[PDB]
Symmetry: D2
Subunit: 293 residues, 4 copies
Amino acid sequence: MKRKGIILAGGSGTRLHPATLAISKQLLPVYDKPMIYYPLSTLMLAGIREILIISTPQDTPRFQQLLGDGSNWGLDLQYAVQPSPDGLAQAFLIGESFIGNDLSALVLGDNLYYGHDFHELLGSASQRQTGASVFAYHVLDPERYGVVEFDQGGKAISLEEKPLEPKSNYAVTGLYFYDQQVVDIARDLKPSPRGELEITDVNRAYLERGQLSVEIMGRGYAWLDTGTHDSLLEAGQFIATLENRQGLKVACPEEIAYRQKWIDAAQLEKLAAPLAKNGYGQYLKRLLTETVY
Amino acid sequence: HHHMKRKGIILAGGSGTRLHPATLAISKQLLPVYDKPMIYYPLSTLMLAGIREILIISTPQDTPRFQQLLGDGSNWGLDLQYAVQPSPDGLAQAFLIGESFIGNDLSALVLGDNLYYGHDFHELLGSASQRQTGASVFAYHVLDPERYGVVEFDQGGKAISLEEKPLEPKSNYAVTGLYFYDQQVVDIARDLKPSPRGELEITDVNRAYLERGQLSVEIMGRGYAWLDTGTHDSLLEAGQFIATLENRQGLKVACPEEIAYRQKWIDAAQLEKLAAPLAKNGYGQYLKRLLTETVY
Amino acid sequence: MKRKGIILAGGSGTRLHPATLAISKQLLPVYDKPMIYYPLSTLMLAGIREILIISTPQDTPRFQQLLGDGSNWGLDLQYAVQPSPDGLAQAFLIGESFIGNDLSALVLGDNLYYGHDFHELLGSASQRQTGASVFAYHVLDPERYGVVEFDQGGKAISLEEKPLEPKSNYAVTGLYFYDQQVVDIARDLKPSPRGELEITDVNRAYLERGQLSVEIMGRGYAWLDTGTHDSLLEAGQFIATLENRQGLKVACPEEIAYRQKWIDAAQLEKLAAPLAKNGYGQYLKRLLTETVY
Amino acid sequence: HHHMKRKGIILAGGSGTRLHPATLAISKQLLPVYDKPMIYYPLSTLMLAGIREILIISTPQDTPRFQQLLGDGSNWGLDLQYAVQPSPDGLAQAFLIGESFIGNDLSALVLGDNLYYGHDFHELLGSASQRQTGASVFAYHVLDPERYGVVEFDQGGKAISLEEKPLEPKSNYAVTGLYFYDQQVVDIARDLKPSPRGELEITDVNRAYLERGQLSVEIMGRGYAWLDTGTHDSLLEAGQFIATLENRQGLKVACPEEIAYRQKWIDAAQLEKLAAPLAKNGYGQYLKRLLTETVY
Ligand SMILES: CN(c1c(N)n(Cc2ccccc2)c(=O)[nH]c1=O)S(=O)(=O)c1ccc(F)cc1
Ligand SMILES: CN(c1c(N)n(Cc2ccccc2)c(=O)[nH]c1=O)S(=O)(=O)c1ccc(F)cc1
Ligand SMILES: CN(c1c(N)n(Cc2ccccc2)c(=O)[nH]c1=O)S(=O)(=O)c1ccc(F)cc1
Ligand SMILES: CN(c1c(N)n(Cc2ccccc2)c(=O)[nH]c1=O)S(=O)(=O)c1ccc(F)cc1
Ligand SMILES: [Cl-]
Ligand SMILES: [Cl-]
Ligand SMILES: [Cl-]
Ligand SMILES: [Cl-]
């Protein structure tokens, strides 16, 4: 079966104002590319080509202008809007008809991932055709997130959203795979005390049915924080260090498409043309002739 | 028969494709430098020079976004007006585009991607602003002067030549992106012919003032930071730099609300209203603290 | 068979003076711990407990004071000196009697590694009981290093040290595993045009015999640069971002020992005592009661 | 019957176990801040104040390493002497340990882990150094004044109290780690009794001057950077900050060779000799460039 993707790139309220007064966070750069390139690249690494992008009513034209219909990158992009920030699960209501009868995967528009064999970690989540797969990652501040509690045997036994007193230091990352059950689970959700349709309520629905796979995302992966000005800066510094050391880019969608064999050498060459005078075009050109393992 | 204050221009137009793809969805001057939009810094810089009437020049695509962020200036005791530069034809064009805005007044041009920091910056700007005749620029020692307008000095310290992006610079002293002009500038600008790059050059403007003995070049000392936003790397260094100062001090660099409050262009009651819609984030809480604390 | 380790923490000349005028680079911190903790931790992750540390004649007391005989961390540390910086291969001459008849592994004292499943990448190199295993990593500046050339089939066909015109962008990292042949290969080496006993000559010796395994260290690993002031700063910023995000440390030797089960809970507790008032002791204490996957 | 220049002290002793294990093998003041040892910055700071006779106070373990780095000062036109602090008994102890070094002279105490940057810093130091009677300190607005000596001001700006690490600070104005004293300091220091932390407090010393009407507290403006080296995080921010300024400018912060050359304590011939053993790295190449270039 096929899996479809959703990037939720909606409003972060006034939290980062005035930096985000003018445009939504996910259109701002992390180092050399718009933030949304990173979760888009994530979906593409998981082998997902049909992708729905959800943003504020103000910002859809801007994502649409940036990304197009995706055909240039061998993707099929569609767009939809979240009128108000009423919770992550709302992605599945807005995205209901896009999903139709397929498998799905939700990625948060402001989450960055890096690590060895990230392709396979996604692939093993993508392969599971029933139930939901999520990731748990050790963090210093688990109160900010969906917290997963494990028993002595390592089995996930509870989930709590932003608990006052967290049960472990393991947080559910912003990457979620679901089967055909998600839409129907989402539609039955009731708004939380914070007025939000909670993604953690969707994930707890699968947990009660014993259908939630919680895979550990090991300490050798970087799940980067874009929630504060400070953490945003750290993410830019982290990506810059990696790219300048290696002469290789992180989350370059044109490169990912090309390695997935969704575009051929001749298309990459055309994509390399408009940016030819800067480092990004120079990078895409160099990928035509170099072997990178 | 006919019978002086200074107006400001911020040029925040198209930085071309140079920083694509990071700048595909928005112009550079709306990207943040740490906790605030880049345009806040040159705006705060004009304000520090005592300038309240300011023209913002941007692309047709991005003007509404600048307008949404900044308004007409009334919240901050300013008057902000808007003009478009449909085609990126060079910095000097600001004066053709801003001709009617300028009228018969003195003026100041600042690049919308330029950040400054340092002690007695107010007084440095004040002395350039008080000089009512001729032009005033600032020379700053940089590693890579080939990237800029470069000023050559003689033994006595007098500026004797200006060159734009010379391959072999005569000194390491670059002209910063901040410029003060008398009433002659618009006319100088109209008589310019495009360079062999298809651009109306600010260096040709400054040379004109120099050839007439009316260019003052003041040194901006090594104790000031004139920060680079020309690359992705330098942009990142710029944010790290502001963050270090702000987290150290508990004070902000280029907070426009604060600067208007200190110039006495808005009062305590007005600052309070400015603080309210941001009361739950660090920026609003900072505006509120300014109401009770004495900061020397 | 057993494998023994050598950390070469010798002189970097005047290259970083005056920052390194007072003490050798490998005794300076990267973020929260002395640099040498990182390659030491690397050896320990590869399961190596008997370790020789080589430094300048001036700096051995300082390493000796810092690290002791290792018994507190379940290691067996010995020390030796490199009188002059006459090449990396000299590690095997100085280290000849330490190595005796065993397998060995050399790590450079100023190299930092991070990534998912780094333990297994080392383990698979450590398992090979014959020949030499090295790693190749894509870098922007291959002229600075030992450059490995691959044929269309991906087989390593040449090695050149600091070539004027490098054949690929793949550099041999500062981590090397050898069998019993290394000492004898090293002893027959002749000084290069730069007056150095070249590690690349040792590795080319195994290559000619077809006994050099060149494993790719993928782009999902970070091999960090400590060669310049700028790169040293980047390494500190990179480690700080990882540790503050996760609440977990990179290359904490006490933790690594404890997870390898070379020290028990009661010993970790004693190690946590002197530093109790700072974050490092607080970290070691917290490791007594928390489950970390 | 008996019948004024100023001596300097740098305290670069034990920072305890606080930054262990990073500081297990060497003391903090020899860790680099970017391209140079931390001790270079306070050393350059004393030099900028015109002080040439300087006592370095370190642990018995690390004195030889300070001596190996710095020598007797003769290469840089200074005279450097050494003393040990066997036990970390508090900052004021510098004056008991440095009593014979000081003699009948004025003095200046600087913390060996403190970095300063900004425009007309020379003149700010000059005005503190010229005041021959009483003591001089600097107050700087910080986010976390609870960590420092905190000065309270009245409506007219007069300093009226000093508190060491108060839980509820009276202002955000911290006393920086740079202190100028007349001849009374040693005696004040000898009469101090240890605090309820087992330490001889510089704040008790400064309070003594204040209780006598002889403490001048000058504001160090927000346009100066007074950088934090108290944590691993702030140390990293410190190096990022120097690197940004130096890579921007093609000039160094706190290069002692340069500062002595500019004070005229060494001449061109001497600077050249200093440049030679480092001719192949960036630091030596920088010393050589200083011989031919005019830097304003
Ligand atoms: C560094 N990574 C990376 C890669 N590993 N690759 C190689 C790769 C490309 C396609 C399929 C499998 C591997 C890339 O072409 N681009 C990359 O950015 S990654 O897999 O950890 C990654 C990929 C996408 C993303 F959004 C974040 C990190
Ligand atoms: C740190 N600086 C600064 C200040 N000195 N002040 C105080 C001040 C405010 C108005 C007049 C004189 C001084 C501020 O209110 N905000 C500031 O950012 S500054 O002069 O170096 C400056 C000011 C404006 C700007 F855009 C960049 C730097
Ligand atoms: C982040 N890493 C790491 C770990 N993965 N672990 C977990 C671990 C510990 C022992 C054996 C296998 C795994 C640690 O205890 N400390 C670590 O620093 S690492 O394997 O990539 C590593 C380990 C040692 C080192 F020097 C650099 C990086
Ligand atoms: C950037 N500064 C500086 C300088 N201004 N100068 C120029 C200078 C040198 C001697 C006297 C007056 C000025 C330097 O030669 N080195 C410097 O680091 S500074 O005044 O802010 C300074 C000086 C010494 C120090 F330790 C830290 C900062
Ligand atoms: Cl892992
Ligand atoms: Cl200056
Ligand atoms: Cl990889
Ligand atoms: Cl100031």
